[PDB]
From TrEMBL, chain B:
PROSITE patterns xrefs: LIPOXYGENASE_3
Binding-site positions, Fe(2+): 347, 352, 536, 540
Metal-binding in keyword set: yes
Name of protein: Manganese lipoxygenase
UniProt keywords, alphabetically: Dioxygenase, Manganese, Metal-binding, Oxidoreductase
GO biological process: linoleic acid metabolic process; lipid oxidation
Cofactor(s) this protein requires: Mn(2+)
Gene that encodes it: FG02216.1
Keyword Disulfide bond on entry: no
Domain Lipoxygenase: 78-664
Length: 666, 664
């Protein structure tokens, strides 16, 4: 059977393989650049070939697929980050090829933004893009075989499960929908210990516990009152600050009216979205199961002014005639407290507390500390291509996406970047960051977690805490060794020319007054440790599981699609139809779009580990004191790997069925 | 045991894990940017902060490790390609974010180089770097537990095998104990990195060899050649003509060692030959070598020629293949020949540089909208920026270095350097139409269409490409017709005439067709894809496997050719090992590093994904639906052909190494 035939019998015959059975996983960048040109999603230019400032196409795309558009955003956003990298190379903000530059020059390159943009103090950069990403998202899409179709929970649950691959990176493949009881008190609350935002829960202030005891009396629950009065390890996740941050009064309601645009000027058609300044009360039991006791939907100064609901179950083992799955008021209350934990996570805990706090310290360090010095050499490796990425996020993620799907507004789009709430929240979260308080060891004390001395194993279900305590120590231990090699006494630090003006540059221009004025060896070691902790394990801790928790929207949605129930009465009268009405499920209210973005957001952000750092730092110092450095590395390398085992134990050590925390694994 | 203890019991206790047991596989880019700065391998700048044109450090690195330096080159070269990409973005040669630009503008951006650089016609770009890569390569390295230490074949063979853990990717030809064997040497001309240049032997040569065979006194070999049943040839004799060297000269490269800039006076010498090989393809399909002319100087009267003791795959001799040191040497020489021809002509010119020209022509001539531009430009993603980093480094910094052409390394005069003269010659004697697969196979003398004898069973490149070429042409056919239904349309098409012209003139590819027919367009467009993907892949995918075990395919000799035939036959293992880059002396450690490094540099994007992608954009409300079909058939045709490829891999005679190269 010669090649002559072999070719013909393949051309002649009907297709043996159906292209539709094989789903498109990643783009031919060349094909996709043709399509962005074909569709006029490109920069327009004059005769002389200089930029207009407008795009080629006047209007966006008409029809598309969820599947297809999800991919098209992933890609356009990658291309945008490539652009950002190539730019910061040209502007020399982050040069690709190395270049020696004297401090005196780097002050003229690394210059602060002025707040014009509506963001905190970040590197200056020498809306128009946000247009292009809208143009990618069609007017309307084919709703058949999408993950939001429903129109009921069971329907989207069935779809969600179907998308998982056949027989930590395996975890990556799926989401929380894998668990049938994702909605459960147990799994809802464990998200506050081992989720994407496990660092903001704290012990409940007497002042609040009083408020709730007082509210519990009024609703008539002697059981709940007794528990709170006893007050055995009552915890809190308090989003009440949202109002204070946005400057909204107790009589206002968080809302975002989404104006639909035909190219530039709106159609007059609008969608509305609602977020609440929720509050949650938990109890941590002797066995270590964290359990929710109360949710204030939206907190407006007091619980007299607020809609508050208490759990029917007062214990992990407590049983009620109504099953968790059918308790629609509670399930709603929990869905609200997830829209709260979405904003706090995505805005404060990720974007500010790791990315923007960082960018400031980087600018300070680049302006103040010369490329030679020890500090610069142990820090700058952890800041590889951070500035260029942070930019693509300023010019897109917040305005184009976080501002869109979130229930803050007051309007989408908003020309006024100031006066927009999201930005006011970014601004507030930035100012009320506390550099020294988010040193792990302090963090755990302030919030009320005896991780040091507890042998009771009530913290068995809090692996973030147990992992970070351990890991923080190992990083501090590495930092300690290295810093001493030059800073043997508090004098050396005090006479060091750069450290004084460095601590200053940050506290002033960086607007991080909580950053220490370092004099001691201890103070330097902590600050340097924090910077790495922030640049790696923390970013990782609050970014690695982002898809898993957020991609199944009904488990953690970004904002509500129905105004809050007007009072408690209403709330208790809620049914499945009320809960589904609040979610972005079905065709109406342009809910298809929110689902796409809300689920897309992780993939945008999920786009460089410690072991490789150590290995690399060792393999250069094999030739301050470079040998002491080398040791630091080869111990650090070991300490991590040995701690890596201890991490996987805390993951197993959680009570029956409690999902893994595999996040800080080498 | 609380976390308090768990931390203590890790700090307190002796380290459970020794960092030295875990070798460094990949760099923290941040650490490595600090080290390149620390070591002054960086661009220097004045008070005013503009570039000098010199680097910070005056001198290079003192000591390093083969392992460590191999990695440090891999990385610095990656950083260099990133730089090139970011630059072509700034200069808008290849913009990262899309931008509509009118043809009239693209003529002002996409402009031809002038030959100053010593290279053929390529995009203009708005030594200094080659300095930085030298600075990475130390003065001398620790020779202990390196793959060149030896000091004998068995020694480096034992090391080579030890390093083995996409599975194929893990290892190299050393996996086979009889890598040196007639069988495996010759199969490299059918299923190696250069399987497209072997051809049927001209009567004029077969006469020459019959004549030489008579003189040496081998009635056996004479009878075989006179009978002349499927005699093939791999003829490198053109090297002299290309470099313009006379039959009285010897190819040599005197490598001057530098202390930063000005040389130390210390030199190494390297020698290449314009070899010729004669094979016979047997009924069963085993290709078998019969003769090697070490270096061909006008005739075999002037040249050292050697005939194989074995006149057949099954033929046996009292001396084993493994101990036949003259033959093994002769074969090692004919590999230095196939190294130059491969790395220079078959890869760098025939795929990368021919391409760059057509890209420039297409960008200058055809507007971004047009059908041609849309089906072509996807196959040229980030090609121009990469091609640049190669001009500014691979040739001068590496190919020119390890190759035995010179005449000097480094050479200020880019012209007058032989490598460049060979690039130049290979470029001019390319034939766009003749390297259409179907023609290629006919000219060279391969009835792949009609042969049912299965003598071509051991030539999977041929059988795979014939099949694949057809499937690509079939896809191209469908798409082109959707706009070009008749030869008229093509003839009146404004751009095609001036496009074919732009190439034949400015691109210096006169062999590129003046297209009038539908057939002519379809072939040209097919060739461009064939060249941009399966061909580049065919002659680049196995580069590590064949080249990384240097004694199997070394880039140049480290001993002058034996003076005459007498000498050659008097060769022993010690002569063969003397020619290779093994041991400490003659700075042979360095050649091994680069020669083995070269693949990994070029190793830095398949058809299925193309099809899938082209389908998933043309699924919406020329004709886009006909396009979409073309895609969803092409998608299938590939996958179905993908099976047929793996059959030809199995279909090779016992033990003949796989050809897995065109696998989706
Ligand atoms: Fe991030
Ligand atoms: Fe290549």
């Amino acid at each position: 059977v010669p090649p002559r035939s072999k070719l013909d019998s393949i051309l002649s015959s009907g297709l043996e393989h159906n292209i539709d059975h094989d789903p498109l996983e990643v783009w031919d960048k060349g094909v996709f650049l043709n399509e962005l040109l074909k569709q006029g999603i490109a920069l327009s230019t004059n005769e002389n070939g200089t930029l207009d400032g407008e795009l080629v196409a006047d209007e966006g795309l008409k029809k598309g697929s969820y599947k297809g558009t999800r991919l098209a955003l992933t890609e356009i956003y990658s291309i945008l980050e490539d652009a950002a990298v190539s730019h910061f190379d040209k502007r020399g903000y982050e040069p690709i090829f190395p270049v020696k530059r004297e401090l005196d020059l780097k002050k003229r390159i690394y210059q602060w933004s002025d707040g014009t943009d509506g963001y905190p103090p970040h590197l200056k950069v020498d809306s128009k893009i946000a247009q292009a990403v809208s143009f990618i998202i069609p007017k309307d899409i084919d709703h058949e075989n999408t993950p939001y179709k429903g129109p009921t929970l069971a329907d989207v649950e069935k779809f969600n499960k179907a998308q998982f691959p056949k027989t930590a990176d395996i975890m990556k493949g799926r989401n929380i929908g894998e668990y049938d009881d994702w909605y459960s008190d147990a799994r809802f609350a464990q998200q506050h210990f081992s989720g994407v935002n496990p660092s903001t829960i704290e012990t409940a202030s007497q002042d609040k516990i009083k408020e709730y005891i007082s509210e519990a009396q009024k609703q008539g629950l002697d059981k709940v009152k007794a528990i709170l009065e006893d007050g055995k390890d009552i915890l809190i996740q308090d989003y009440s600050y949202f109002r204070e941050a946005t400057g909204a009064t107790n009589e206002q309601i968080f809302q975002n009216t989404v104006y639909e645009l035909k190219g530039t000027t709106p159609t007059g058609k609008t969608t509305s979205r609602y977020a609440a300044a929720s509050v949650v009360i938990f109890q941590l039991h002797e066995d270590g199961r964290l359990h929710p006791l109360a949710i204030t939907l939206d907190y407006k100064g007091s619980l007299d002014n607020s809609i508050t609901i208490f759990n029917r179950r007062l214990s992990p083992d407590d049983t009620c005639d109504i099953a968790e799955k059918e308790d629609w008021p509670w399930r709603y209350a929990k869905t609200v407290a997830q829209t709260a934990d979405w904003a706090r996570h995505e805005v404060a805990t990720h974007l500010v507390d790791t990315h923007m706090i960082e960018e400031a310290i980087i600018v300070a360090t680049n302006r103040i500390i010369p490329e030679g010095e020890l500090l610069y050499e142990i820090l700058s490796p952890h800041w590889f291509r951070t500035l260029s990425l942070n930019a693509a996020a300023r010019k897109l993620l917040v305005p184009g996406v976080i501002a869109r799907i979130a229930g803050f507004g007051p309007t989408s789009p908003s020309l006024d970047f100031k006066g927009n709430n999201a930005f006011k929240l970014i601004d507030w979260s930035y100012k009320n960051f506390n550099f020294q308080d988010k040193y792990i060891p302090n963090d755990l004390k302030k919030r009320g977690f005896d991780i040091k001395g507890d042998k009771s194993g009530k913290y068995k279900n809090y692996p973030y805490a147990n992992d970070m305590y351990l890991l923080w120590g190992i990083i501090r231990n590495f930092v300690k060794t290295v810093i001493e090699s030059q800073y043997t006494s508090d004098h050396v630090v005090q006479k060091d020319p750069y450290i004084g003006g460095w601590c200053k540059e940050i506290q002033t221009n960086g607007q991080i007054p909580t950053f220490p004025t370092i004099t001691t060896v201890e103070q330097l070691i902590d600050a340097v440790t924090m910077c790495i902790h922030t640049a790696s394990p923390q970013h990782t801790a609050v970014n690695y599981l982002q898809d898993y928790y957020y991609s199944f929207v009904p488990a953690k949605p970004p904002a509500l699609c129905t105004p809050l129930p007007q009072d408690l009465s209403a709330l208790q009268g809620y049914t499945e139809k009320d809960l589904t009405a609040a979610l972005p499920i079905g065709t109406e209210d342009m809910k298809w779009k929110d689902w796409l973005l809300a689920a897309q957001l992780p993939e945008l952000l999920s786009y460089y580990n410690l072991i490789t750092y150590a290995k690399s730092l060792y393999n250069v110092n094999k030739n301050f004191n470079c040998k002491t450095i080398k040791k630091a590395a080869a111990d650090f390398y070991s300490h991590l790997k040995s701690a890596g085992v201890e991490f996987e134990n805390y993951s197993k050590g959680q009570t029956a069925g409690t999902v893994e925390y595999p996040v800080l694994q080498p």
